[PDB]
Design a protein around this nucleic acid. Sequence first.
DNA 1: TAATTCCCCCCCTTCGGTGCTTTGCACCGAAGGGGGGG
Lengths: 403, 540
Amino acid sequence: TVPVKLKPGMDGPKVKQWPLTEEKIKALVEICTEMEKEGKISKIGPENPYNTPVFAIKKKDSTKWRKLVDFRELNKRTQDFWEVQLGIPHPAGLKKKKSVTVLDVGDAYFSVPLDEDFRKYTAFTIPSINNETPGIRYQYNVLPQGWKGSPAIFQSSMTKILEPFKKQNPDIVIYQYMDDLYVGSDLEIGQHRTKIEELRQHLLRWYELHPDKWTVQPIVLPEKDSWTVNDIQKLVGKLNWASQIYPGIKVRQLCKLLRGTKALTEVIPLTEEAELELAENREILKEPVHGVYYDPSKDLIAEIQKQGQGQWTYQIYQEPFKNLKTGKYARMRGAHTNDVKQLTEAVQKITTESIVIWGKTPKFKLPIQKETWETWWTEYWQATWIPEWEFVNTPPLVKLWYQ
Amino acid sequence: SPIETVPVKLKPGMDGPKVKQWPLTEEKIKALVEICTEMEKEGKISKIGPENPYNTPVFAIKKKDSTKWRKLVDFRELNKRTQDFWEVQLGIPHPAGLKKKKSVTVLDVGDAYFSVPLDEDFRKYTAFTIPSINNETPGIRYQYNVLPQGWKGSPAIFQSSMTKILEPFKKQNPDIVIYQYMDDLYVGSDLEIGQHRTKIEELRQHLLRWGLTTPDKKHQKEPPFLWMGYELHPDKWTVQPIVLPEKDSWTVNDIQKLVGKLNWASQIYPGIKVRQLSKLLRGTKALTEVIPLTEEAELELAENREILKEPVHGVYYDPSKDLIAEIQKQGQGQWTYQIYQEPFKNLKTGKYARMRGAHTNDVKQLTEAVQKITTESIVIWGKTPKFKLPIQKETWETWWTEYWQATWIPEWEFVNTPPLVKLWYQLEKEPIVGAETFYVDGAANRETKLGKAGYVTNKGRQKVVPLTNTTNQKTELQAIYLALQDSGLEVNIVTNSQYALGIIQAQPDKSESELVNQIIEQLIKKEKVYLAWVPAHKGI
DNA sequence: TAATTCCCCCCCTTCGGTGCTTTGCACCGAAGGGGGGG
Ligand SMILES: Nc1ncnc2c1ncn2[C@H]1C[C@H](O)[C@@H](COP(=O)(O)OP(=O)(O)OP(=O)(O)O)O1
C-alpha cells in the first residue's frame, strides 16, 4: 500500500449526506452489503469524524446501479498526485484523434488495498427512508472509485496491463482520468469497435467521442439591409463587449451614428465610414483570438448560459475575456422540456471535452438556483466523476452576445 | 452492558477540564447524592482519589415525569477539548411516513446513556465532585464508567451501540418494522396481537441480554401511542395537543414561542400563517420587551386559533398509491401545501414563507416551495410527489422559456384555485413602433451622496430631478421610474444601467425596495414596455 | 444576571463574509431566538 497523506494544513472531508430516493437507497444498501461481504468496505462508528456524500446512478442504457461517492473535498485535499506518479502528461494527440471511446475501469481499483491511515478519510453514510434508523457508516478498505489518488496509485498496474496493447497498437492514444480510460484511434469506426473489443478482452483476461468534430463558436455580428436605431444600439453594445476580447475593435463611426435622441424604430442609413468600420470589425471577429495559451498551473473555469429553445452556450477560460474554448450545446428540444436535465447533460459533455483537451475538469459557473441543482442533478448524472461548480445569482452580462 | 466501548480521545495537545463546581441548592445536592449512591452501587460511576486532577461541574434537572431527577454534567470545556464526531442521526422520523400496521408497540430503553459503557482511557476526564450538604466535609469525587449526559459524544455513541444491538434481531425478523430514535423504539408488525406480543417479549429479552432494560412504565401496548410528539391511532395520527399562550400583553420571547408552536402545528394543521407575527420580531432587542400587536398579527393570531380549534389528523403512507402535493397561495409570499394520496385525506401539511432575494415574483416563490416540498417528500417517503399547482401551463412555459436560469418543476398539473399564479407584466422583445422613446440617465457622486435622474425624449420632452442620499443604482432606478411616470400606455426606455435592467427583466412583483415596488406598479399599469440597454456615454 | 449540559430536524431574524463593480448591492451561511424529539 502507498502511504497516502493529506495536504499540509488540511483536516479532511466533513460533508453532510443529502437525502436520497427510495430506489437509490435500496440500490446503495444492496451494493454496500455486497461490498462489505467481500471486504471492500467496512462498517465504522461515529468516532470517525469524516464524511463524504454518496448516491447511486444508472449508466447509459444500463439496468445496473452504480455507487458514486462525491470525493470532491477529499480530492481538493490529498496531494497524493505527486507522491505517486500522477496521470501521465496529457497527450496532445487525443484532441486531434478521430474516434475516442471512454471505458469504465474503476472496478480494477477494488483489487488494490488502501493505506490504513487514509481509510478514515473515505467514510460515507447511507441514509434511511423516513429516518427509520440512524445512517449506516462505511469506510473503504480498497482504492475507492472517484478518488483522485486511486488512478495515481493504480498507474503502475495500469501501465503493466496496457503495455502488451500499446506496443502492438502504437497509433492508439490511451489517457486515464479518474475511473475512465479515453482511448483514441484514427481508424475506421468498425475497426475502432473491433480494437475496443480486443482491449476489453485484454483487460478482462488481465460511448464513442469524436474530437475532430469539436468546432469553436465565434461571435458573429448580424447582417441587415436596413439598420434601425435599436439595431445599431444593440450592435454597438455587442462590439463594446467584444472589444475586451478583441483589442482593436473600433466603434467610433457607429457610436457617431447614435448621437441625438431618436426613435428606436427610426431607420438610419449607414455612412460609408460606418460601413467600412463594420466590415473591418466583422473580419476581425472572423479570425480567432490569438494570444491565449493553456496554463497547467491555473484552474479552468467553464461558464454556461441558457439561450432558450434547448440551446446553451459555454466558454472555457482561465482568465477573463481570454477564452480557451467557446462552444454551443444544442438539444434541439425534441420532447425535452427539462432544463435541469439539459444543463446536467451539457455539464457532462463540457467536462468530457475538457478532460480530452486539457486533462482537467473545469470549475462550472452554473446558470441555475443552487437548491434546484442540488435537488435534481443526481437524477440525470451518468458520469463517474463530479466537477466543482458554483452558481451564478446575477443575470449574465453577456446575455445574447454569445448567441 | 457487554457492548464494546467506542474509542474516544481528546483533541491533540489538549488536557482534561479543571472547572470548579459551582454552589448547588440543598435539594439539588440531596438529589445528586441519592443518584450518585445508586449509580455507584450499580457500577455506573466510580469513586476517585487525589490521582485524578480533573473536575467538571454537575447539576440536576427535572425529567418529564417529575419526582425523578436527570443528572447533567456541564461538559462544555471537555466538549471543546473532545475529538469531533460524525452524527448518525440524519433527521426525524415522521408519522406520515409510517405504513399501516396491524399491531404496534412503543418501547423505551431505561437509563439509556447509563446502560452504555464509556471508553476506559476517557473515564478520567469525566471526573466530578458532588458537593457536601450545606458545606463542611470536602465533596465525594466520582468518574463516569458509562455515557454521561451533557457530553457531546454520548448521543452518537449510544445511537451506534443501539443500532449494533438491534441489527441481529432485525436480521432474524425481517417482517418487523423497528423505528429507533435514540432509545425510543416503535415496533410495528402485521402479526396477530398475541404473536406480536410474543415478538415484543423476544425483543425485550434480546435487549436485556445486552444490558438494556425496557421498564413497563414506558412500555405502551394500546392505542393511542405517544410516539415522538405524536399520537398514533390504528388508522390516523395527530400531534400531541398544542397549547397556544393566551396573553393580554406579549413580549418578544412570547412571540417567538408562539411562532415556534405555530410552525410545529403547521405540519398537520392547514393554513397556518406566521408572517405578521414574525414581523413583530424585526428590530427588537430585549426578549422581555413588550410588543403590542399590530392589528395584522391580531388577525393572523385569530385565524390560527380558529384553525387549531378543530382537531385534525393525518393518515399513514400507502406505498401502492400515488403521492400528490397540492399548493395554494396565501399572499405576502406565503404558501400552504397538502400532501395526500386520497382526496381530503392529508398525509401531511406544511407552509413555505421564506423570502429569498431582494426582488422576486410569484413564479420563483412557487418554484422554491416545490423544491422544499420535493426535498421533504424524498426525506419522508423516498420519492417525489405529483404536484397540483395554481399556475397555468402556459404561464410556466412562458416563464421558463424566457428565463435566463435553468428552472424545472417535476410532473405537475394545473389546479384552478382562484388565487392563481401569474406574471403581472411582460417586457417587449422588440421596440414598439410609434411609442415614445425615453433615454434615461441617473448619476450620483460618492462623496456628497447627491445625484440627478432624468430623461430626454425623441419628441423633445425632457426632465431632470435632483436626489439626496441616493447612490448611482438608486438614481438609475429613479430615472426609469421617471420615464414610466411621464409616458403613455406604450413606451420604449433606453437605460445605461445594467443593474436596473437586470432587476426589471426578472419581472418581480414584490421587492424590499419601495422604489422597485413603484416601478413594478407602473409596469403593471402600462400596456407595452420595451427596455433597451445602451453601453455608456459613447452615444445616446 | 442567573442559570449554567449534549445531539438531531425544522422556521425566522441578524450579521458578517464574498463577489462583482455601479466601493453599493445582492446572496448565502452561521448563529441567535423559538418549536419539536431523545
Ligand atoms: N435533557 C437532556 N440532556 C441530555 N441528554 C438527554 C436529555 N434528555 C435525554 N437525554 C439523553 C440521555 C438519556 O439517557 C437518553 C434517553 O432519554 P430519556 O428516555 O429521557 O432518559 P433515560 O433513558 O435516562 O431515563 P428513563 O430511565 O427515565 O427512561 O437521551
